[PDB]
Amino acid sequence: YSKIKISGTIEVVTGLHIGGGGDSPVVRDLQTKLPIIPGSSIKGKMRNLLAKHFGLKMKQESHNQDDERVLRLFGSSEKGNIQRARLQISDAFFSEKTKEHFAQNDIAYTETKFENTINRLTAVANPRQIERVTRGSEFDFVFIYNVDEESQVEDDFENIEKAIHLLENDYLGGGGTRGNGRIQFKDTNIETVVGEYDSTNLKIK
Amino acid sequence: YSKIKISGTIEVVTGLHIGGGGDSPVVRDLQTKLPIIPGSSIKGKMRNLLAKHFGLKMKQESHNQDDERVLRLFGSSEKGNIQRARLQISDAFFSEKTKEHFAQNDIAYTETKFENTINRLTAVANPRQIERVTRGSEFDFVFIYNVDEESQVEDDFENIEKAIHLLENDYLGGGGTRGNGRIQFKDTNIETVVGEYDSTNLKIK
Amino acid sequence: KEHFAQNDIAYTETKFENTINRLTAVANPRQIERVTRGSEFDFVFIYNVDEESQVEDDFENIEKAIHLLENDYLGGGGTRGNGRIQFKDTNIETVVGEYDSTNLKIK
Amino acid sequence: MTFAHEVVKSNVKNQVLFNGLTTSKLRNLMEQVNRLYTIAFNSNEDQLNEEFIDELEYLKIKFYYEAGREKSVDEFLKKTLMFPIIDRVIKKESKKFFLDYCKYFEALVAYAKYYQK
Amino acid sequence: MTFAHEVVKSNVKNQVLFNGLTTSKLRNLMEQVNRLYTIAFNSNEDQLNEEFIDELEYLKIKFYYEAGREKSVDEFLKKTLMFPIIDRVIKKESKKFFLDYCKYFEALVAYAKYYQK
Amino acid sequence: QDMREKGIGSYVDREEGVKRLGVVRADIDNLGATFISGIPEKYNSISRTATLSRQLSLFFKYELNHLLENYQITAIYSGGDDLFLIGAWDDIIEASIYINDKFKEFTLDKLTLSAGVGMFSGKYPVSKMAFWDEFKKNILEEKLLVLQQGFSQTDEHGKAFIYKMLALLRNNEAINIARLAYLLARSKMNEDFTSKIFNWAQNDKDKNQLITALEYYI
RNA sequence: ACGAGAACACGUAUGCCGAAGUAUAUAAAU
RNA sequence: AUUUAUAUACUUCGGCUACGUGUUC
Numbered sequence A, B: 001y002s003k004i005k006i007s008g009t010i011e012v013v014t015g016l017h018i019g020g021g022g023d024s025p026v027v028r029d030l031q032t033k034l035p036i037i038p039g040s041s042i043k044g045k046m047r048n049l050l051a052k053h054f055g056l057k058m059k060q061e062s063h064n065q066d067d068e069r070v071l072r073l074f075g076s077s078e079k080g081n082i083q084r085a086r087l088q089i090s091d092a093f094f095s096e097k098t099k100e101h102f103a104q105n106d107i108a109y110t111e112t113k114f115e116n117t118i119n120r121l122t123a124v125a126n127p128r129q130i131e132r133v134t135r136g137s138e139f140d141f142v143f144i145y146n147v148d149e150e151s152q153v154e155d156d157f158e159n160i161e162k163a164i165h166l167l168e169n170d171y172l173g174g175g176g177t178r179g180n181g182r183i184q185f186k187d188t189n190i191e192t193v194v195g196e197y198d199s200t201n202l203k204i205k
Numbered sequence C: 001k002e003h004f005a006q007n008d009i010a011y012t013e014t015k016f017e018n019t020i021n022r023l024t025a026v027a028n029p030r031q032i033e034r035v036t037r038g039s040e041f042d043f044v045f046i047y048n049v050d051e052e053s054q055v056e057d058d059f060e061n062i063e064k065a066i067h068l069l070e071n072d073y074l075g076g077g078g079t080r081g082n083g084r085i086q087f088k089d090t091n092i093e094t095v096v097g098e099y100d101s102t103n104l105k106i107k
Numbered sequence D, E: 001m002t003f004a005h006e007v008v009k010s011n012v013k014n015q016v017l018f019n020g021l022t023t024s025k026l027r028n029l030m031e032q033v034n035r036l037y038t039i040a041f042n043s044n045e046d047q048l049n050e051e052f053i054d055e056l057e058y059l060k061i062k063f064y065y066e067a068g069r070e071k072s073v074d075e076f077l078k079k080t081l082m083f084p085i086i087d088r089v090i091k092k093e094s095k096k097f098f099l100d101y102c103k104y105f106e107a108l109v110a111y112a113k114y115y116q117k
Numbered sequence F: 001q002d003m004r005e006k007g008i009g010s011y012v013d014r015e016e017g018v019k020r021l022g023v024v025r026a027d028i029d030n031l032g033a034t035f036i037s038g039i040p041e042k043y044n045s046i047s048r049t050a051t052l053s054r055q056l057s058l059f060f061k062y063e064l065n066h067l068l069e070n071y072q073i074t075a076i077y078s079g080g081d082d083l084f085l086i087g088a089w090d091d092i093i094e095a096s097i098y099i100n101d102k103f104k105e106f107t108l109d110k111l112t113l114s115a116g117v118g119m120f121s122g123k124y125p126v127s128k129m130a131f132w133d134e135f136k137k138n139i140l141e142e143k144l145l146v147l148q149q150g151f152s153q154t155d156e157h158g159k160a161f162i163y164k165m166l167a168l169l170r171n172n173e174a175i176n177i178a179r180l181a182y183l184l185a186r187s188k189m190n191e192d193f194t195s196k197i198f199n200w201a202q203n204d205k206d207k208n209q210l211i212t213a214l215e216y217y218i
Numbered sequence G: 001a002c003g004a005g006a007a008c009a010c011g012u013a014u015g016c017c018g019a020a021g022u023a024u025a026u027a028a029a030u
Numbered sequence H: 001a002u003u004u005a006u007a008u009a010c011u012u013c014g015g016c017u018a019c020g021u022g023u024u025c
């Protein structure tokens, strides 16, 4: 029995707006008054994209069942052949190095870029202001992967690489189709934090 | 399943005043502090124009519900229906060649044209300072085309190229009726980023 | 308690969540209550040595258990990103009897 | 404290609002206070930053200048006593009281917004 | 720092402003400072550019020339001590202090604008 | 549709509110004297004591059966001076008030009822499940109806908005009151609803009644 | 030699969906 | 060489924790 830890940083290519508070603020840790990326959001988008990559049928659309590999990697425990999740996502916190950079260069942590709404036949505008983390900021995340079985490890990491690759060409947060919330992954590290399984041959881009 | 990347550059033919943050400045980043074209503006312009170019009834004009192909391409999902936007329109960034061009030509990043308000039969003037992105500026943009159904890629890219053309013959931003907001598209490249879909016979002007 | 009272910090947060219906893509909201990050809890373990020749093995096992727990979650939704904990300021003190408890460690 | 509500009711004269004051005359005003609202809500300690003191001074700058432009703005800024409360905030260096002033002005804005032609 | 406010109140004499100074006499002045305001607000580092040093010199040129034209301009530019503060800004090569001077002059302008005939 | 007796879940599975259970216990407070003291000095005959006892027995053994016919409640212990009804949370409260009024009619407002109702989750050991005018007129009739009409006319305001209302109201601080003023400014109700709610929150008795009513809503 | 003893309120799922910071009024008179 | 200095309208609208399940041998 062993566990594999995945570490890295998520850079916001453009404005990210998680904004679970609902004006229209962003989720903040109440210990440091900072915007965060909840892990469950990351894991849900990975789930959705990876499921859509593999078979996703009408009858599969009905029930939130999905391909055996996706269910195996993310766990269902809903009907009959239940599978305990092998992969645990953690939250992301606004890193310390970006603390230093935005302190030294006096850069705001959250823009308020206004938007509008031109409805038709009246053309009357309607204004709104939303908050989104500033460009270029980085967040630190950590993953933990369980090996309940020995042989499958390579395939699961292949699927993880595929999921990350798809997610890098998509959005987190909201308004993604409208420009917000693009990210890229960088500075990844894979290490066996507990156990006796090697991981030098395993890579996630 | 696959994704298709639409990349290129937008040059700016006359003044550009997005002014989303607003003497009345323009939208500007806060990591490097250069003006940007919010993807929301790109999407709003493209949607409104391509929608109006085909049919637009008063009942259609009522509540932002339009013909089936726009509602497919840009996504509505309110009328008890399943549809997500098939284009991911991102933000635009003032490219590096423009950086170096204006840095080594000692040309400002933005003009500041002054305006006036001549009142009728009163001839009293009301001043006005306004700011705009200079001519010749170029930004880089990316669109991501998700492929949901195999059989509609060709027609959707025909509609996308018509949208690009009609936008090229129209303005973008604010105060477009007074001569600022003209853009033009060039250097379009099409690549398949994830999957096994072919992107050879596909062109955009 | 002193730190949060000084800094005027609510004891417990409330995160908002959703869920996506497939073929429908209509989200039904969700409300969950979560203990604030960075709080500290006080814990005490009592061990009753009944066999002399087993204390080292037992404490090795309990260290292994702590090690796994540090790399796992407590409570609910652990795969969703909550419950990660950490252990600090651990001391080992014998309080009844005459067994030396200075060579035992728990990190 | 709702004394703002009382003054606004006392300011509906026979109708006009503050004798020619409109909510859009207040644009620069609430924009400045909200901008300061963000920069202060980011802060941690109640002991105010001293560029924050400079920013409050700049806010008082905007106040006199708006008063200089328009007579209705002058009447509004004088009777409802923005000016001593800003002075005492500058004298006190307290963040929570700064947000108290913020909700004060926002109360004025909202009540006036419902209290219009 | 509001000592500008104090001097402007001390300069309302029995009424006239700086003995014949008008805000429109200041046109070229605030135009130059605002132009420099833009070119500096574009910059990134606090270490000033050296054509920016040249531009500050040119600003001092405008100061000495405006003073030469009008006596009221001379009195204004001398008492409220534009001139040492420009000298120390030239000596210091600091951007943030340049914007501090900018807000200073704008404070003068706004307060005078509200303090008029 | 099924005549066979069903389990506790038949009442738990109601979708009109939280899937819980309601329980009511009642005793005549002035009963010891009633059987002992009776009608003083002129009608304390064995005959009249017998009549009094039988009339109480008939009330607590017939009328309840007819009264309960419009409630999703099941009669458990009835008789003597003890009344035990179990069912849906809303139906238990409504039946408790209605039976209280009906009893006040039968005793012509001479005997009163002392009762307590709690909420517990389904299939809890019923053993441990078991171990007036103001509430009707002010809470159930006035504030509850106001809140129901307002929440039915204005959408998007679910348990989250009401729970923020609760967080502001339970922590009785003026900062919560100002926050609630802003929240009602932001809310999209008729101005009458907002004004009434805020002014109720400003009074301690009215804030307690309001929180009770809105807790009943969910 | 305590109505005690074993026993993770636990497992699957997000703040999403659509919305253009718009629409008007010449840096002028001697 | 002599007066303005951004002006009035709108400052988020629509639509509001489901299931395995409570208890014992």
Ligand SMILES: Nc1ncnc2c1ncn2[C@@H]1O[C@H](COP(=O)(O)OP(=O)(O)OP(=O)(O)O)[C@@H](O)[C@H]1O
Binding pocket: F027, F028, F029, F030, F031, F032, F035, F052, F053, F054, F056, F057, F080, F081, F114
């Ligand atoms: N229908 C009836 N006829 C005659 N006696 C009755 C009848 N119902 C109840 N009683 C008697 O009246 C007595 C009342 O005592 P009990 O303690 O149960 O209620 P209580 O004294 O009224 O309690 P509390 O005053 O706390 O409400 C009981 O001992 C019971 O035997």
